[PDB]
Each structure stands twice: as C-alpha cells, then as structure tokens.
Amino acid sequence: TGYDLSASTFSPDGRVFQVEYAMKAVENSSTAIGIRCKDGVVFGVEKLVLSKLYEEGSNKRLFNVDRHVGMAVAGLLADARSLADIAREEASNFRSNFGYNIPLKHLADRVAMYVHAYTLYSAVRPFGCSFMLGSYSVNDGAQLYMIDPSGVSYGYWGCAIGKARQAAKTEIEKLQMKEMTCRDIVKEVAKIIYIVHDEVKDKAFELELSWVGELTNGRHEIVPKDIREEAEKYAKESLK
Amino acid sequence: SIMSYNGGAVMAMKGKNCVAIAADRRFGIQAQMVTTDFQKIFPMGDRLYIGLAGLATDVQTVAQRLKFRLNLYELKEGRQIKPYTLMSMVANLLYEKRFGPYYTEPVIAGLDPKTFKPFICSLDLIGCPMVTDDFVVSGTCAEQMYGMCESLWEPNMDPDHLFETISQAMLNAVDRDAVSGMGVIVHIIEKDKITTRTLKARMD
Amino acid sequence: GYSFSLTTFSPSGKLVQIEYALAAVAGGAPSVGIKAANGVVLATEKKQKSILYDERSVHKVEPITKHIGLVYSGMGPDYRVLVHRARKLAQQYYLVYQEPIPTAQLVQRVASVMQEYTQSGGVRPFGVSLLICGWNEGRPYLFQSDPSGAYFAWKATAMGKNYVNGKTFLEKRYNEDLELEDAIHTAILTLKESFEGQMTEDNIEVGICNEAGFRRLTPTEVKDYLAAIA
Amino acid sequence: SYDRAITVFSPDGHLFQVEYAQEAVKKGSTAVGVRGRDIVVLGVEKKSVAKLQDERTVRICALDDNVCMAFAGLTADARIVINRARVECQSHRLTVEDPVTVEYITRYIASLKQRYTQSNGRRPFGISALIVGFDFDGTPRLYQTDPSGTYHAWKANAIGRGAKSVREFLEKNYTDEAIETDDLTIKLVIKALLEVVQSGGKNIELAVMRRDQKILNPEEIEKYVAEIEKEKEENE
Amino acid sequence: GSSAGFDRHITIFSPEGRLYQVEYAFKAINQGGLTSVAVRGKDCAVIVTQKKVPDKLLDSSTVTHLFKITENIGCVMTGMTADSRSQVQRARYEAANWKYKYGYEIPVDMLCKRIADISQVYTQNAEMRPLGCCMILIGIDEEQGPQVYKCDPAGYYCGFKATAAGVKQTESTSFLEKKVKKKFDWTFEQTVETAITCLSTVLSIDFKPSEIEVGVVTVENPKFRILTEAEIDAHLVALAER
Amino acid sequence: SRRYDSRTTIFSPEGRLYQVEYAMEAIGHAGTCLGILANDGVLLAAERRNIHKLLDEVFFSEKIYKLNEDMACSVAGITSDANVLTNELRLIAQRYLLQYQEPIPCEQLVTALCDIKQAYTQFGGKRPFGVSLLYIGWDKHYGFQLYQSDPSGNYGGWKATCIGNNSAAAVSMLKQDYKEGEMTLKSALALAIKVLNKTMDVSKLSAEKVEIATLTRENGKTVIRVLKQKEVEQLIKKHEEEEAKAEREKKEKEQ
Amino acid sequence: NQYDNDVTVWSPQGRIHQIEYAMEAVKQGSATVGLKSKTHAVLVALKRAQSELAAHQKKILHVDNHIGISIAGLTADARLLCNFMRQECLDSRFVFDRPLPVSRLVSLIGSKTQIPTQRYGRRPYGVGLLIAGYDDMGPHIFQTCPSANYFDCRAMSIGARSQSARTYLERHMSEFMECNLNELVKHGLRALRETLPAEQDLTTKNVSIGIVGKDLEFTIYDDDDVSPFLEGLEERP
Amino acid sequence: SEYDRGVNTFSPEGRLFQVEYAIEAIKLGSTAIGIQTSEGVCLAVEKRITSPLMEPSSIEKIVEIDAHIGCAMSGLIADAKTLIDKARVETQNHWFTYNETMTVESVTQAVSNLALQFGEEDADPGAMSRPFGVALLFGGVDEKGPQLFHMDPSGTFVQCDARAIGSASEGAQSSLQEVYHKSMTLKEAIKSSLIILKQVMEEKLNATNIELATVQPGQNFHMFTKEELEEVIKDI
C-alpha cells in the first residue's frame, strides 16, 4: 500500500517512511568525523575522487557558515549547499538584528526547524543530507552539534556521519578527548579516517581537515598544509 | 462649507402616541434654485421615516445604500426593523466612511412596530447618535429651528396640535434662511394612518 | 493547500463524507434538549475514564452570549472551533446592530460556516452536531445543526448514542405545559435511559435558559435535582 | 486557486478532452446554415414540450444588429460564449467607431475556445457554433467554430446530431439553381432538416436574414413543407 | 474496521466516522521508548521523565525533554523529537504574544487550549499531517493552585490530578489511580516520591540520579525548576530507606 | 495532490459531466415542488419532509423563500446549498435595485444565478450545487412568470412544472389537466391538490404535509401569501368531496 | 512504479528516479570536450543536426567576455540557464564594475537548479553544461549536472560515447598544462574524434571551437575559422 | 489512466512525455515545404479541404509576420495563433525601440522561448498547461540574406536549406535531398517544391488547394494569387 509516498502520511505503526528513505540516502555517503576537545573542534572528511580529471578542491564537503562556525556535510551535496546558504543567512540576520555573533546552539535550533519544516507536507521533499556544526568562543567554549534529515539536533563530544559511522564511533570512543589538544586531535582524526576507508570498494580519496579553537582565535579555517601532511604520514604509518 | 452648497432643513418632533417629520423642498446649486420638489424624507417602513440634510448627492447615495441594507435585513430576519436598530445601522454606515465622510446628517422618526411608542433621533456627520424626548433638527438653519422648537414644544400633544407646532416652527425658521425654503412638507405618523401635508410657504 | 473538494457526489446522489460525519456524531456521548414554557434545558453526559480527570477543566455546555447556549455530540476539537466562530459572529452582529443576536440568526450563520466545509478545498466536514438554546422576544428557542449545514427547530430532541430510544422516550413524556423544573427532571430521566453506572453530579452537565439568561448549573444544584429524581 | 492541467496530450498525439467535447456537440440539437445570394438561412431543431413550455421571452441569438449565431452542445456554455461575444462587439463599436465584421467576432470566439483548451483548471467548451451575417460591402457570410478553436468559412453547413448525414445531403443538393431565389434556399434548408429531424415541421425553427434588416411562424413553415411534399411527389 | 478511498492516507472520515491518521499519530508517540509522569499536590506540581543516553559520545546536557515555556510554566514532551521542538517553539511564541497583547502572564489552561486548537487544524486540513508528540504542562495559577494539563495530537486537552504519557501509560495510569483513591493531600516530598515510585514500578528499574529528570513548581517558588543530580539523589536515598 | 484529486469539472468519454448527473440524481429524491401559472396569479406547492411530532413551527416557510418584493422561490435537493443560493439571489436582486432603482426582472435574476451555477461545472475543481429551483414572479415586461433551473445552469420558462420526487408522473398529469389560457387561481389550486395527491403516494394527503404559496397583484402591489392550514384543509375537503361525487357517478352508469 | 513519476518521492533505496532520468537526457546528447592549459581554456563541440540541409545545431554559446558554455541535453533549458548567467554577470558589472568570478557564477547556477528538485510539480533542468572561463585565479573548466551538482575539472567530456574521450584525456592530461594554444586545441580535437564511429571524421562543418585566455575575449571559431586548427591532424589509428 | 503523470515528467529515456506526444501530433498535419535560395525563400503548403462546401480562402496556413518575414505552420493550427501574435508584437517592438528590422533568427528565438513555458504549479495565472502542437517554418530576408528556420514543440530551432514538415515529411525530405543545390534560382525552387507537393498530396494539385509565398531581397512578402499559381502549375 502507498503509505510511503508522502511526508504528510503516517504508516499504521506510526512511521514517516519518506524521512527514513532520506536517511538511507545519507547512509550511502562517505564518512565525515568531528571531534571536540576543551579548546576546539576538528572536522575530517574522506572525499572520494571519482576521476583523476577532477581538480584538488572539487566537491568540498567542509563549509564556512560564519567566521566562527564551520559545517561538515554528508549525503546529497546540492541539498547540503542549500542548507549551508540557509545557515549563513540565519547567522547574518542574527548579527544584523541583535548585534553579536550567533551562539551555535541557537543556530543549530533554527536550521533544524527549517529542516523539520520539510517533513510535514506533500508539496515538498525531505532533505537528503546530514551535517555537523562546530564552533568556538570564549564565553560559550567549544560546541559540536549534529543535525539529521528529520530535524533532530544533538550536542556531541565525537560524531560520525555516513557509511562507516559505527566503526568510526568505535574508534572515537577509544580517545580521552576532553584532556587532549587540537594538535593531537588532528592526527587521531586522520588515523580514524584512514582506518575506516575501504580500498577495495572505494578507490581513492583526499583527506579534508579543518578546525576552530583558541589556536585559531575562534576562526574556522582549513588546517595548514604542513600539519595535514604530517598527520597523513602518521595515519599511513599506523596502518602498516 | 460643503454642507451649505445645496441647503436644506429637516425637523422631527414627538407627540403623545405620534411623531411628526418635516422638511423643506428646495433643490439649488448655491444661490440658484433648480427645482422645488426635491425629496428629503424617505420611508424605511410603514411607521418609520428617515430625513436627510446636506449635500444632495450624498442624500441620494445614503438613502439608496440604506435601503439596500434594510431590505436585506428584513429578508433575512422575517421581521420589521425597530427604530433604534435602524439608528445603529445608519451610524455604522456613516462611520465606515470616517476619513472620507458622507456630507449628510440624518433624523429618524418612527413608531415601534409592536408597542407603537414614539422614537426620534439625530445623527451628525460621522455617526454619533442623539436620542431625545422632544425634538431634533438638522440643516443650515439649525439655530433658527432650535429657537422655534424650544419656544413652542409642549409634552403630550395630540396629532393636530403637533402638526400646528411643527408647521409653525419650520415655516418661521426657514423664512430666515436664504438657502432653505420654497415649500414645506410634513408627515404625521400615527398608529392607524400616515398624513402627508404640503404647506403654504414663501417662494422667495 | 488543496484547491479541490474532498466531498463529492456518488452515483446514487449521496455526499458520503457527510454521512460518515453523521456516523461520527452517532457515536458520541448522549445529549438532550427540552423546550419548556418558561425556559430551555440542555443536558449532556461527561463520563470520564478515570478519577485522575479534573472535572472543572473542560465544559461541554458553553455560553455564546448572555441568552444563547450550546451543547454538542461528536468530536470535541471541532466543537471548540465552532464555539469560537459562533462567539465571533455574535460579537459582529452586536457591533453592527447594537442588539443581542436572535437565536435563529446565530443558527443560520453557524450553519453557513458548517456548509462551507462540505464544499471547500482540502477539508473534511465537521464531525459534530450542535444543540442551540436561546431566549428572544419573550419566547424560548431550541435548534439543531448537523454536519451538512442544515438546521431544525425542535420542541425536544436527543443526540448521540441511543438517540432513537431517547426520541421515543421524549415523545412519550413531553408536554406543552411543562415548566422548567419538570423539564430538567425529564432531561435527566432521558439521560438515565442510556447510562452505564451511577449518575452523579460530576458525570453529567446541565445548562438552562430562562428570562434571566443562560447559565451552567453548579454541581450542588445538579445534586439536588438528582436526589429529587432518585 | 485550482491549477490542475485538464487538457493534456495522449500517447498518440490526441487531446482527449477536446474529443469528448466534440462528443458533447454530437449529442446536441441539429442546426443547419445555408448562404444565399441576398439572404442567409438558419434552421434549428426544437425540443418542444406539449402545452407546458413558455416561449415568450425565448428567441438563434443576435450578437449585434448584423450578426446571428446558432449553437449545438451544452446550452449554458453557449450562453456564456454569447455574452462574451456581445461585450466584445460593444467594445469594437467604441474603439473602432464601426460595426464588427463577421470574421472578427468569429475569430474572437474561436480564440476564447482555444484559450480554454490550454489553461489551468478549466475544461473545454462543449459547444460548436454557426455564425451568419453581412459585411458592409453586402457579402453574405457563414462561419463554423469547433470546441478546439478551429473556424472555417462555409457555403452550407450543419452541426449537431446527424450532421454527417445532413452534410452529405447538402453536398449532393447544393447547386447554383438552388440559391437563385429566397424560397429555393428555404426549401433546401427545410429538406436538410427533414432528413434527420422526424415527426415533421413543427420541430423546426427557421430564421432568414436580409441586408440591413425575420422569423418564420409555424403556418408559413407548414406552407413550405407542403410545397416540398408536392415537389417530391411530382418526381413520380 | 472498514475503509473507502484515501481515508487511511489523509485526514478524512472512514465509514464508521474515524480518522485513521490521528490514530496512527498516537502510535507515533510510543516510537522513542520513553515514559513521563506528572503529579499534582497541595502546593506543588512535579514532572518526572525517563532519560536515556545510548552514546557516551553524546553531550548529556543537550538530551532533555523538560522545557521552559515561560518563567512559571514548564513542560515535558513525549514522542517524535523534532515535532516536540516545533510545538515547544509554538508554545513559547504564544505565551510571549499573550503577555504582549493582554498585559499579564498566560494561564496554563489557556496555553493548552491554544496548542490544541493549532493541532485541530492538522486533523481537518488534508495537506499536512499531525505531529506525533504529546505535551504535558505544569504551572501555578494564583486563583486555583497547581495546574497539570495534557494535550494530544487529536486536539484533545484536559486537566489532571495525575497523568502519564509514553510507552507505559496504561500501567502508570493504574498505579496512580490506586494512589489517588487513597487520598492524602500530598506534600512536596510525597508528590516527588509518588512520581518516582510510579516510574520505577512501571519500568521495573532502580534509578540512578542520571537516569531520570525531575522538574518542579511550587506556590512558594512559582518559577519552573529543574532539579540537579544531588537533589534527585537525596530524594532517591529517602525512597530507598523507606 | 494529483493522487487525491477527484476531477469534478472534466468530460467523460461520452461527453458527460458526471458530477452534474449525480447531483440530478440527488434532486430526484427530494420533496416534490410544483408550480402552476394562471391568468390572475401564480402558485407554488411543496411537500414537507419535516413531519416529526417533536418538530416546532417558527419562521415563514420551510421550502418557500422570498427573494424580492415581487419574486419567490422553492428549492429541491440539498438544503444547505439552497440556503447559499437564496442568499446570493437576494444579493443579486438588491444590487440591481441599487444600480437602476427599479425592481429586477425575473429572467435576469434566473440568468445571474445560472451563470453562477455554470461556473462550478467548468472550472475550480469544486463540486456542483445539488439544488433545483422553481421561481415565481411578476414584472412590468412579461407579467406573471414561472421558471425552473437545474444544477447544470440550464433554465426554462414554464406554464406548469414539477421538480423532485415523482415529477414525471406529475408532469404527465399536468399535461393532461392543464388548460391553456383558461386558468384561474382557484382552479390552479384544485389542480395542485390533485397532482400532489397522486404524487405523495407514500403517505396520503394531510395539510401538515404540504405548503402552498400564492402570488397575486392587488392595487398595483405584489402580494405573496403562504396559505394557512385552515385554507389547505378546506382545499383537501373539496378534493375529497369531488372524488366521492366522481365515484358515485361512475357507479351510476350501469343502473 | 510509484516512485519514478515525481521529483518529491524518495525510493526505498534512497534515490530520486526523476533526477536520474534527467541525467539520461545529457547522456543522449552530442559530445563536447573542455580542457585548460596554464593560460588558456578550450571548448570543442561536435555539431550535428537531423539532416544535411539542417545546419548543425549551435552548441557553444557566449555568456560574457570571460565566460562561455557548451550544451548537452534540452536546448530550451540551456537557453534559460544562459540568460540567467548573462544577467548575473551584467548585474555584477553594474554594481561592482568588475567581472563576476567564475566559481561564484557556478555556485549561483547550482542554487538555481536545486530548487526545482525539491518542489511538487516541478522538474529538473535536463541540461548538462561545460563552462570555460578566465579570471584573476587563471583559466577554469567547470561541469554542471542536472542533479545541481557542479565540478571543477582539469578536463572533461560530456555527451554520448564521451567515456572514450575521457579515457584519452586521462592518458594525456599531464601535457596540457605546458601546451601552447594550437597544441591544446589539437588535443581537444583528438579527444573529440575518439567519440565518432570509425568511419566518420572531423570536418570544418561538424566542429565548433571556443577559446578564452589571458588576453583573448571568448571567441567562437566555426566554419573557415576552424581550418587553421584542423590542419596538421594525423589520421585516426 | 491519464493523470498518473504530471506534465513536467521525464521518461526513463530522458525525454519529456508531453513534448514527445506533441511531436506525434505534428505528424498528423498538412505538408509544408520551405526552400532557401540566394534569390529568396519559398514556402508551399497544402490546404487539406475536407468538403466541397468549404471555402478554401478561409484556410490560412501561411501568414505574414512582417514585410520581410513569413511563416508556414503544420499541426494544430489553432495553437499557432498565439505564437504568431507574439512574433508580430516582437517585430513591431523591435522597430519601435531600435528603428530597424528584426533578424529572422531573433524572431525564431523569441517564439521558441515560449515553447517550454508550461506547467501546473509555481506558475502565474494565465500560464499554459500543455505544449504547443505546431511546427513552424520561418522564412525571411535580412542583412545576412535569405534565411529559413525550423521550430518544433520542444523549443529547438535550427537553420535549414530545404525542409519539409507535416504528415509526408520523410518522403518529401528525401525528394528535397535529391533536388536541392546551392545554385538554384527561385523559379526552380518554386517548381521543385510544387513537384514534391504534387507527389505527396492525396488529392490532385490545382490552384485552390495549395498556398505559395515568397520573400525576395527588395520585394516584400508575396502571397501568390490564383492566376500566378495557375501559371506555375501549367509547367508541372
């Protein structure tokens, strides 16, 4: 029966199957990881290269949503880009009305409400993307939130989204991340990314790293190239 | 003044089980007389009448819109309207145009359709109702009518004495206003008859 | 929104959504209305599922104006929507005509509102029927308005579960010379005809209209009447 | 607002709703038009109820002083189209200061019908029309419009039930002799109507239009029918 | 249980007068596996909810179903999390707007009525679905005392002495019925004890301060309060020493 | 949206508008209404489907509505749709009186309402109005008039007609017994009672089951009157007396 | 199938079948190649029409003095997107007096194309685009898909049988950065020749070229203008 | 069923269903032929006359867009009237703004922009519900010389040397392949097109069942009269 064709229809057991199918869309994507320490947040993405004809920096999955806020996405990249624009507009409007930088919890709540508005009607389709928001400020500290296609936003210490999320979570639980520094976290992130990657099915990939903390003066940015290459060396050594 | 452009005088008076409503007959553009049989008193029921003074275009407009609303009310409700209800309806109509006013002032005179109790009221430019037990006046010669009515009116008058009083008041008041006159028409409303009379007046 | 009608005509000429709304009405809690010579009585059953329910919170008998009262059978949320609409309509009438609205006029306006939902786009009919009481021109009025938008004038009627048996009971026990106290007794008897358990002052709700206006009976008064009946 | 697409294409290249509107036309009353040398003749079939119909305010309708129309199909749709055409005729008199041409009003009606075959939330008009008139230079004109917006000019035509049979009859009987005088054209129209309209001539309404100016009452129609039966017998 | 048409897919009537989508929305509340209990006392109102953190990677602060609507009104949400957050946002907006328009704080019963009115529209209009969440509100009214109100996806709202919501609602209702029949006008400690005992008994779990959330309102302090772990442990050790 | 659309305003493969035909079916099951036109007046006669003992009398009539000072109507079908349409008819008449300051002619009012009803069969995706109407009136152009309209938007002028339950049998009897140009109001009332007698076969004829309305002209004003139960009982007594006499004379022939 | 008619319906596998069906439109179309050196950017297009009288359909369009596009799929959608891009560049010149950066234009296109894929009763844009541009960061080649996804490429071919062209380009891509203009254009022409059936060859009629660079406005070489480039091209293997 | 799919739905092969069905509607129409020569453009169409009672002069398959541009249409002729009005308005607006004549390519592009502007939702009231069922041949003379363009319902427009549209397009196109060379004179083009049209028509080609028009440098748009048509027909 057609209980699964609209987002405005419940099934007899109380499920909206369209949102579940969007979640299935998220599970097919490559894995993104976020780890939070007392002084900052680090984001790592396994970016699959589908051809050698593509440049370095094509299909970025890490975005700057505000000068203090960064975003790591998985799923359908076009939906992720539209959501990134929504988040940017929310941050801009908050600064223009109230006069300071938006808190990360408020931004996550607003974006999650915008995402939830697409799970209610037959006229629109749910988003096929999941994402993590990360931020640092002196007042609020270091914050890492995750939002899924239904509109649930939760705060995390370590989060993984995509195809190898469970194995990545197992690896993240082995770290005492609260008493670690952002420099160590980058190497551990790279190591976990190299562990969860399946060379047989997925051919080749780039490592996309970014961070935000007191080390960066509360500005979200790409990890400098030397730190990235050192971390990649550590990760490739660990795999033997 | 835009009210004085066409002139006109209407008056309503209360008796014992009777009401009287009188009006002038001139239609003119400022100083020139055009006709001497202009209607200013309209029937809104068998024992209910409304008189309008002011700009003649607004007089006709307001009468026609009021009949629209009254006809719809009487079809929906299956009853005849009470004079107080008509007062409220007219006030609502006039206040809907608060910032683009109709330039007319109404007087209502009637008998209650069940208990046959006299009712007279007046409304100003935007719809503040004034209910009185003696008399109401409206028009360009309001002060003259006020003096005559204050001097002549008595409580509990029979229809004949009421006719004499209102006729004298209207005649002598319009004789002192230039843009009002050219005849007077009087309606005496009783329980069992309506009496319409035209008065012998000055045509200068 | 949806711009098309969900209520359409069947080959036999029926509007079946209206009939299914009537089925929803026939499954609701019983209601009774009686027109006496000096007043009107509306009585309903509010049999809560548990002692955990606080009986003073929600009322099924509602005032619309000083002299108009309402009761329902069917779906409660729809009843609340209709109550809000009726109160707004009465206030609009008062603002225009400076008079409290006649009961028939209120019934006609509310029935127009109910008709709109049998023909508009993207909506279903109201799953509730309404009993309306009023006092106008020194005379009492009782009306019934059904999901279709049709209104009837009743001397006495019953709605909800076992309404056919209540109708026969009222036929046998109704009289033109009834005074309001006798009418209240008769209404409580009609409710007793279809009641499971012990009827107390907290599982029934009564309202009355007389020359003074419409009011909802306090539990003390209902206890006095119930002691008289028993 | 309602923005569904009603008229869409089918796999074979067909607009099914237009074809169903043509079926609706096929169910309607028969109308026949003949173009004469000096006159134009318009005949229709009447569905008459014995003694009970009131035909005092009923007219074959006039769009202006110079243009007449006959319809087949859904009568309410036809009323809508006629009122729109009348409004357009008054607008043309205002804006051009001259009376309309028959082709101008035919074009307006056909474009209205086409617009209703390509708009959201609307179904096509279930009516076909015959339009007769005279131009300023005094040429007689007869046009036909279809529910799809297709209009042509004809010498003789028929719309409605059994229009195929009437059109075959007209094809076999429309010659230059038959148009010589007014009576011959009226006889042609009456014969064509009698082909598919049975019971007789009381079911027939006949209108004749002349330059700068006519409805046949039942007695004259009976006169013509008797003449037709005579001329038919003289074949033997 | 007959059907005809799209009556199981949109909010229209079935031949028996039922709305199947509303019943399915009720089924949606049980998805989540949580239970909440609200109890009213002489001068207090208490809400106790089950707190489950499956991941040690989750920040436990952000996992909460107790929300603050105004300074004096508190709520617990049960069911689909995003729908719950949407309803909380709507409630906050309505209470703020009431304060702006009428000049005094919104009563709890009026707030529940407004939320249920909003929910009714979803059961009458066919292009939207109901929300799979239940809302329980507690407050203090300066004329009637402690107030506990509940609204469901159908549009029904009611006021209670005690109530439950979630997976184990029926068993909790039975427990509370027995407790209320043997009536003791409950002190603050007795009310909290009753709620925690109901949750423990129905779930068959001896609670650790981190497995429950408690939220209170009192006549003396009318502000909505969330209890810290130490206070919850005090109540739990008192419950055990019984 | 496309899945749930009922598509009311489209054609069938045979050129039929199905919702209109179903609404016509709805009208075939409602209470009977007959209209008869005479030389001195015009009348409407309806059967009352509200015949419960516990029903109350209030208002003016159940099926007869007054649209104007000079016009009235009777409805068959869905009652709420009728209430909508009669409100709109009153509005149209008052708008005409505002524009021209004369009463509206009867056919113009019928045409306006029928334009409204045609609109619902052509666009909008909504269901039609399930109501047929009979209109009686007087105007200064054509005098006393009787019209009928149906959910499609079609109207017709009649001398006598019937809508509702058993209307075909009524129309046959009217064709048999209607005299063209020789009709007074009294003989029209007699004919109406005869037709209603044969049409109300489910239950025999009592005054509480029928309502009769009359339109006449007196002193240059139009009078619309609903007959009291006394007068209807008088009419029914006359019918029974005439029938008994006819039966007696039928039994007279053989002896 | 109940999942393949609307763009708002997810399948149980987590796909939207309408977007894949729209990508099929790009796969059916004629083939185009794009490549970049360190100084220039070249678009080579295989023009064709239905018949010989019918002139070969226009595949390379002029957007701005620094931007041009190649088309595959529905031509009317391509003209819609072309007009949108032209207006965006014009607005940038009106407000900031500078050319619009190419990456920002591709971002705007992606934003425009994603909206129809989320709304009921809309359809994707059945057009695949290849964008050649020059700005302050150098020469750029971009690819646009009907799914609203865009790519930054070193080289790319789209259309029918374009996998063989992509294979050729992958084999030779290390040379492109150091080439001069004629060598780069010849590389593109060889890749485009890889798609033709073995009998067909490259003529002045069926080939269009588009060039942009440090000191050259976007130029479309068609007809005799392409003879300088087609000269000195060895026969196929 | 007909309404399972929307109007903006793709096929599994990557084609819009409604456009394919409209292109199939194109195959049911009359045959139009256009030939481009250095001396001008020739457009020849067949009038499909169904009855002897139809007046062939009311069938307009070739229209004047401007003094330098003409159009030939095939398919659902009623749909073509909107496009032609747009083309005429575009040419006149261009003259108003720029004081010069439009190019044939610009007119074709402006008309082709309307072709895919159909939908149900997210579209303004007065929007189209379905595609156009017409194929258009535009012929004109501008500063580039004589130009001939082809447009189909998909919005695609191409420039052509010789082109046939309609029911008999494939065979007529093969014949045009055989007979077209770049050095043809306009008289040869007219004769060749009439030969092919005679070959494909199911009737017999006389001077009343076809239309021919030319556009030449210096001379305006010319519709052949019956006498000139007979002059050309004599040679065939």
PDB file of N, CA and C in Angstrom, chain C residues 192-213:
ATOM      1  N   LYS C 192     -30.662   9.060  31.896  1.00  0.00           N
ATOM      2  CA  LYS C 192     -30.589   7.824  32.668  1.00  0.00           C
ATOM      3  C   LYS C 192     -30.957   6.615  31.826  1.00  0.00           C
ATOM      4  N   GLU C 193     -31.838   6.808  30.844  1.00  0.00           N
ATOM      5  CA  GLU C 193     -32.264   5.706  29.984  1.00  0.00           C
ATOM      6  C   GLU C 193     -31.091   5.032  29.275  1.00  0.00           C
ATOM      7  N   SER C 194     -29.996   5.756  29.036  1.00  0.00           N
ATOM      8  CA  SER C 194     -28.873   5.231  28.267  1.00  0.00           C
ATOM      9  C   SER C 194     -27.548   5.361  29.006  1.00  0.00           C
ATOM     10  N   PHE C 195     -27.547   5.174  30.316  1.00  0.00           N
ATOM     11  CA  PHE C 195     -26.385   5.457  31.138  1.00  0.00           C
ATOM     12  C   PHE C 195     -25.849   4.178  31.756  1.00  0.00           C
ATOM     13  N   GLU C 196     -24.533   4.055  31.780  1.00  0.00           N
ATOM     14  CA  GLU C 196     -23.867   2.923  32.405  1.00  0.00           C
ATOM     15  C   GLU C 196     -23.290   3.388  33.733  1.00  0.00           C
ATOM     16  N   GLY C 197     -23.741   2.774  34.813  1.00  0.00           N
ATOM     17  CA  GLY C 197     -23.218   3.066  36.123  1.00  0.00           C
ATOM     18  C   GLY C 197     -24.106   4.000  36.915  1.00  0.00           C
ATOM     19  N   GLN C 198     -23.492   4.636  37.905  1.00  0.00           N
ATOM     20  CA  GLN C 198     -24.196   5.544  38.794  1.00  0.00           C
ATOM     21  C   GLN C 198     -24.044   6.967  38.279  1.00  0.00           C
ATOM     22  N   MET C 199     -25.164   7.655  38.124  1.00  0.00           N
ATOM     23  CA  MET C 199     -25.150   9.033  37.665  1.00  0.00           C
ATOM     24  C   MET C 199     -24.924   9.948  38.858  1.00  0.00           C
ATOM     25  N   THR C 200     -23.811  10.661  38.853  1.00  0.00           N
ATOM     26  CA  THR C 200     -23.507  11.623  39.898  1.00  0.00           C
ATOM     27  C   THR C 200     -23.471  13.020  39.290  1.00  0.00           C
ATOM     28  N   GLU C 201     -23.311  14.017  40.154  1.00  0.00           N
ATOM     29  CA  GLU C 201     -23.330  15.392  39.678  1.00  0.00           C
ATOM     30  C   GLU C 201     -22.098  15.746  38.864  1.00  0.00           C
ATOM     31  N   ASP C 202     -21.098  14.873  38.824  1.00  0.00           N
ATOM     32  CA  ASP C 202     -19.865  15.159  38.114  1.00  0.00           C
ATOM     33  C   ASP C 202     -19.757  14.463  36.765  1.00  0.00           C
ATOM     34  N   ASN C 203     -20.592  13.467  36.476  1.00  0.00           N
ATOM     35  CA  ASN C 203     -20.559  12.849  35.158  1.00  0.00           C
ATOM     36  C   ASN C 203     -21.719  13.275  34.262  1.00  0.00           C
ATOM     37  N   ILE C 204     -22.537  14.238  34.688  1.00  0.00           N
ATOM     38  CA  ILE C 204     -23.478  14.891  33.789  1.00  0.00           C
ATOM     39  C   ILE C 204     -23.289  16.398  33.899  1.00  0.00           C
ATOM     40  N   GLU C 205     -23.735  17.104  32.864  1.00  0.00           N
ATOM     41  CA  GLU C 205     -23.617  18.554  32.813  1.00  0.00           C
ATOM     42  C   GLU C 205     -24.902  19.151  32.259  1.00  0.00           C
ATOM     43  N   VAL C 206     -25.467  20.107  32.992  1.00  0.00           N
ATOM     44  CA  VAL C 206     -26.761  20.697  32.680  1.00  0.00           C
ATOM     45  C   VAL C 206     -26.615  22.206  32.528  1.00  0.00           C
ATOM     46  N   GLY C 207     -27.375  22.763  31.597  1.00  0.00           N
ATOM     47  CA  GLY C 207     -27.474  24.202  31.445  1.00  0.00           C
ATOM     48  C   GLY C 207     -28.903  24.595  31.139  1.00  0.00           C
ATOM     49  N   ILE C 208     -29.277  25.795  31.583  1.00  0.00           N
ATOM     50  CA  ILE C 208     -30.654  26.256  31.444  1.00  0.00           C
ATOM     51  C   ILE C 208     -30.692  27.678  30.900  1.00  0.00           C
ATOM     52  N   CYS C 209     -31.726  27.955  30.113  1.00  0.00           N
ATOM     53  CA  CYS C 209     -32.019  29.299  29.637  1.00  0.00           C
ATOM     54  C   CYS C 209     -33.409  29.701  30.104  1.00  0.00           C
ATOM     55  N   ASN C 210     -33.509  30.889  30.687  1.00  0.00           N
ATOM     56  CA  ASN C 210     -34.789  31.471  31.066  1.00  0.00           C
ATOM     57  C   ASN C 210     -34.712  32.962  30.748  1.00  0.00           C
ATOM     58  N   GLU C 211     -35.637  33.745  31.300  1.00  0.00           N
ATOM     59  CA  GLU C 211     -35.634  35.183  31.066  1.00  0.00           C
ATOM     60  C   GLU C 211     -34.385  35.860  31.611  1.00  0.00           C
ATOM     61  N   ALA C 212     -33.769  35.295  32.649  1.00  0.00           N
ATOM     62  CA  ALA C 212     -32.568  35.875  33.235  1.00  0.00           C
ATOM     63  C   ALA C 212     -31.339  35.671  32.364  1.00  0.00           C
ATOM     64  N   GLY C 213     -31.320  34.620  31.569  1.00  0.00           N
ATOM     65  CA  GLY C 213     -30.226  34.346  30.674  1.00  0.00           C
ATOM     66  C   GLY C 213     -29.878  32.881  30.703  1.00  0.00           C
TER      67      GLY C 213
END
